[PDB]
A paper describes a structure:
Tautomerization resonance is accelerated on acidification of the carboxyl group of 2PG which is accomplished through its lone-pair-mediated coordination with both the Mg2+ ions and the transfer of a proton from His154 onto the nearest oxygen linked to the phosphate moiety. To find out if the exact reverse of this reaction occurs during the conversion of PEP to 2PG, we systematically mutated each of the residues Ser42, Asp241, Glu163, Glu204 and Lys335 to alanine, compared their activity with wild type MtEno, and elucidated the structures of three of them [Figs. 4(a) and 4(b)]. Notably, the K335A mutation disrupts the nucleophilic (proton) substitution, the E204A mutation defuncts enolation capacity, D241A should make the MgA 2+ coordination in the active site highly improbable and S42A should absolve the MgB 2+ coordination.
Residue numbers in the entry:
A (entry chain A), B (entry chain A), C (entry chain A), D (entry chain A): 1 to 424
Write the structure that this text describes.
């Protein structure tokens, strides 16, 4: 019954106003599903390749070639397959491209199809997406890791740390956790007026105030948590995405808060912040190929704090395996578009989970109205999601979808809360 | 649509000819599913309680009280629930019993319903059981851990080790792995005739030859592997279930091969066998509450060999958590009937997998024609199953079901093979 | 509507771990049915031929050639036929083979299809298999003839009689009859410990104790019946399968309990046991082509005791006709795989029933999880089944299926009990 | 699905213009079936009781009380039952009447319902009636036993033998057998004109010529067979229904061809005719309670000729059992209305078939347009039917239905031919 009958794509805009791919899949039983592909502002070196058109149109970021690839080549390869055979469909897509990085049809063309197929299979089975992907034990609502203040390559300030997140770990439920996050984001606006700092927003929906650096930024978020009537750490803890590749010079070191520092010095710095602040997680504290520094840092602070690989793993099973052997990080950031299929995303989660590593499902800078990642975070029981500040519908659509999943689960829902961060 | 409409149970016989519970669930959409409950010959102290009738009938092992509980109390609690809400159904069963060990309605009455509901939900979604429970990424065929020679409480011999298993890790596919296992079991019969040793079978379908002890038994299996044209270790490795509670005296020590030994001495013994034999796994090397010995042994040999907790964990999240904190074992044996629900089984797998621990899905001595555990092993991607020697349909029905799942997965199937045992 | 649309086979394992054929049939109305083929350890000379692959694989017992025959030749001959036309389908299979013994496609390839078609027709009619084959008057639950102690070619002992069965004839219902059988099998284990005799199992799930011979074996079973609180004969009677071909030399005589004896002497021996023991049935008391001895023996004791032809008839209408004319035996053992189709099985039953002969539906040494024979025994109202000891799911699956049929029939069920053996 | 929803009866006329019962049954799935009850001109003492109204209407033979019983009592007892549970339905009817002979609601009210239910179940299963009752092996077309010349209580002539039948045993198919029967009946009319004998018809559609007696009558039928171009015996054999109760005086003897004779003398007479004429069957050669004579006669000629019990058995399992023990007759006449249910009819067939006895399905003098008995004769593989001369649609409707069943069976049809009468 859930036989793929039709596949079409169109060019749409992402939350930053740049083009991205949207796919629709129709099954012979009348099932219709739609999936949209996110896009990162700055991409890892090792991510799957997005096909972009080049030329004058949309500053060269058009995706009419990806749309044409879905119609000319991918559609004809998957019509007649069963939508339930996700692995067969993703294999057919990977084999049809024939490149390691999906540079021929584009990670953007292939992921659209992989996701739309998974959605059509779940509709066909009459199961919500989280249940279809995760089975009947998918019930864990994740701690929302909300980026309410920006630095690094996301601003023109003194702050080299890219994202400052709040984590409402002490909340009893996801519905309360979301409210705590909202009320801290609103308090932080009011505190930014109090100090004459800018309340202008950036791409991920958080603030970019021109502050001294890392500790200044943390101090303001602590204020905001207290302003909201919540206790820092016990109620709302903190996390960073250093995105340290962005302030790394190839062969050279970490140009960080007006000094060049070694992997080991960055480590000293981070251990500093652990002592002074309620930190549950630090993502990309060192750069995408700094294999020895990462190993050193994990060994130094990995018992004290979740260490998350983003750019170093790019959701890539080959790269995560290298890090697990090397004792590199204790968590994986999961970005479906880094790898290009749902199948390869879940193989990477499996390697992580079976390996002792936690997962954090992540948005991209360039998001869509698509909420698949809220379903995915519950499906894999990550207990953690990074999908933005509680402002901008490309962020809030995910939180709204988590409210809906929590409601659907009833007394079966469990909020990960402090059990996501047992090192804290 | 998949609303529970009717629930009935009956008394049937298990593979040992003792009574057990069979449940049927009908949904309002016409879906009908049947599940049978296995039973262990010797049970752990901490396992969920089976309701048995007592009295003259079937040596007191009747289950007409469990059948009556399904009709009088459980049926009325779950009619009207949705079969897809496994967690809601299992919660309703656990709340209705109201005991920690399921001593009021019986782990046997509750598990029948939990399993039959999961089967009816999968039929209703039109998904094979492994896909419904594991999602579209369920594709790993497990290494069959085949018990071809018995000792301990399963014989009256000098052999204190309970089960001697072959593991066809070097096979390219599950279909070949099964054949390798069969051909080694058949070769071992012929080798047992050659030495005038008995070829009479026991409960798990393997041999119980009266041999010197552990090393004698290993030597005969090595012969059999070679007799089959396979290389010990590279093609067919070995595993034990010591079931060391069976030769443990409370407060006293391990009465093992004509000596009382300490946890540490047992450890010396096991490290001995690692050096001399291609061992991938040892299960219950020490007793169900020997928390300090287990920790010591894991630390000593856990890097060299999978260490499996059976009786020490009884598939119980509270007990597995205690072992993970204490650094006790690196794998969990998964026996649905030890805990009493599918929900609590998957919570225990989740704790294991997320914790770095491997899983091995297990049969019970008293099995049925039911093949749910073949589906479960693929659903959770355990990469390992312990469901008997390749003789007796209560064992072979599971292997036959794994052939069927492999065939259904097509080029999406992956055989766990040597990737199940990275320490070897 | 019940038009055969698809036919596929696969290689699976039987209860002895040797390969056998499994067939699936799909009808255009969405009906899906599965049937598995049993296999005998030692076969009659005149049985339908099993195709086996030869070569190294599985000791030459592979059935990939039978699987290929189902896909290459049988499938194409029966797609488009109506599943309800069993006789047309079986004729098409017999004509396509074109041999008298089914040596071209294999009795194993043809029976799989014949059985799977009958199952799909019954599902399509929405009738349980026993009702579809036997009509609305199929309601007689058979006396289970349970082989709890082995001799002959099934052991290396002094006992030349192959099977010693208990028959719970005085039971009020099949559910009680099964319990009586179980409780006698369990009592007999305990009595075998008491005498230091082995409790190791053989292929049919019974014991093979090294005892003096026939009378010794009977004495132990009588003890076991009494140990269970039942009266020998009135509650639990006895039956033998001598399988006398196994101890016959072509042209020479019956090498039986350390003497060569004539057909007439064997007869004297059997008449001896009738006098001393509550015997309801003796199967193959003389060899497969000893036409004159059989006639002599039937005339001598046929009024005192059921005499069953197994190897002499091989469920073959041509051979049963020869025996009915010659006054040879008063019952037929019915083994679907001896003849190769359901149609030819029922033609043989018809000849038997219309001829005054009773029928006993039989398992094979190599069984599957398939329970078709429980349905067949009720469908033809045999009042007698031989499907093993009440241990091993390849045996117990049949007894469990008889419990289910009894339950489905309600107050319409009748237990054959002592009305199966009017000579006793 | 095939749940009995509605049951209604009406009064209709039989082939003799007397009232009889017609029943309709509707199932909740929309299945509608109609059955009519035959009636015998002269009934056996032991037959099930027909309810008749008494009074002026239709000479007291009205059945409005039977119609009222179906609406007032039987309908309410069987609405809600499953039509497939024939045994449960027939039991409910037998229990509701509560008499041994069905004298409270009438064998006529109960049989209508039993038959209409069986028809509705077969429609619901989408199986022709013969296949639903007999299973997929129902394929034997019976030899038509055609009564072309009447005597006894069916005429006012010198002929005490009630029915003279032709049996086209040497025909290759039922379609040819029917034609042979027709052509002999037509030839016999022409031969009756040649001798100035009457060609006026009686109730069973045959001739009643005023001839000398038995041998005269046989001689005329032989002529007719030859006149048709067929060989007596090899092509068309003979059978009688003596109906000897009709010429028996209680305690006294057999007033037969102008003499009072003993059971033994009747026997001498019959053995006489065997020597002189190609006789395959003689029905009721002695009276309904002449148990010792019947036994004597069977022993004398039973090896030479089928001996059929009609009035002595009345299709009654209790009475057939008495005859089988006493060695009384070798065949049973099967008249559904003698017993009152389909279930009890098939129990009687089962006892017969399993007992070495043949069956002959029979019409009644008072028949309807109903053809159920053609289906029943194939369903039970009787190989013999007695349903009249090949004239009158109450007779020919059955033959026409056998043509239809033969056509539907295709190359699966087998004509019983000479295999119905192995003694000839
Ligand atoms: Mg990042
Ligand atoms: Mg164990
Ligand atoms: Mg035999
Ligand atoms: Mg008559």
């Amino acid at each position: 019954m859930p036989i793929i009958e039709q596949v079409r794509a169109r060019e749409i805009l992402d939350s930053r106003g740049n083009p991205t791919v949207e796919v629709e899949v129709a099954l012979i039983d009348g099932t219709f599903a739609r999936a949209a592909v996110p896009s990162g502002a700055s991409t890892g070196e090792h991510e799957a390749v997005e096909l972009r058109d080049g030329g004058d149109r949309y500053g060269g970021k058009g995706v009419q070639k990806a749309v044409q690839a879905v119609l000319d080549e991918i559609g004809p390869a998957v019509i007649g397959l069963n939508a339930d055979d996700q692995r067969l469909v993703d294999q057919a897509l990977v084999d049809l491209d024939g490149t390691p990085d999906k540079s021929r049809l584009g990670g953007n063309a292939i992921l659209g199809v992989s996701l739309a197929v998974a959605k059509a299979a779940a509709d066909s089975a009459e199961l919500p997406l989280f249940r279809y992907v995760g089975g009947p034990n998918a019930h864990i609502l994740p701690v929302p890791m909300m980026n309410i203040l920006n630095g690094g390559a996301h601003a023109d300030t003194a702050v080299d740390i890219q994202e400052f997140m709040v984590a409402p770990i002490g909340a009893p439920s996801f519905v309360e956790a979301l409210r705590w996050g909202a009320e801290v984001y609103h308090a932080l606006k009011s505190v930014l007026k109090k100090e004459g700092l800018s309340t202008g927003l950036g791409d991920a929906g958080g603030f970019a105030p021109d502050v001294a650096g890392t500790t200044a930024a943390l101090d303001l978020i602590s204020r905001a948590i207290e302003s909201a009537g919540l206790r820092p750490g016990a109620d709302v803890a903190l996390a960073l995405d250093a995105a340290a590749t962005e302030f790394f010079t190839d062969g050279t070191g970490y140009v960080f808060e007006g000094t060049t520092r070694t992997a080991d010095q960055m480590t000293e710095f981070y251990a500093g912040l652990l002592g002074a602040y309620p930190l549950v997680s630090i993502e990309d504290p060192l750069s995408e190929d700094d294999w020895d520094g990462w190993a050193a840092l994990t060994a130094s602070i990995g018992d004290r704090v979740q260490i998350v690989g983003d750019d170093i793993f790019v959701t890539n099973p080959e790269r995560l395996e290298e890090g697990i052997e090397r004792g590199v990080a204790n968590a994986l950031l999961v970005k479906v578009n880094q790898i290009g299929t749902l199948t390869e995303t879940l193989d990477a989660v499996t390697l992580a989970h079976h390996g002792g590593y936690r997962t954090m499902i992540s948005h991209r800078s360039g998001e869509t109205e698509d909420t698949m990642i809220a379903d995915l975070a519950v499906a894999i029981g990550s207990g953690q999601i990074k999908t933005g500040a509680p402002a901008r519908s490309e962020r809030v659509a995910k939180y709204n979808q988590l409210l809906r999943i929590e409601e659907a689960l009833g007394d079966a829902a469990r909020y990960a809360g402090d059990l996501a961060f047992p090192r804290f």
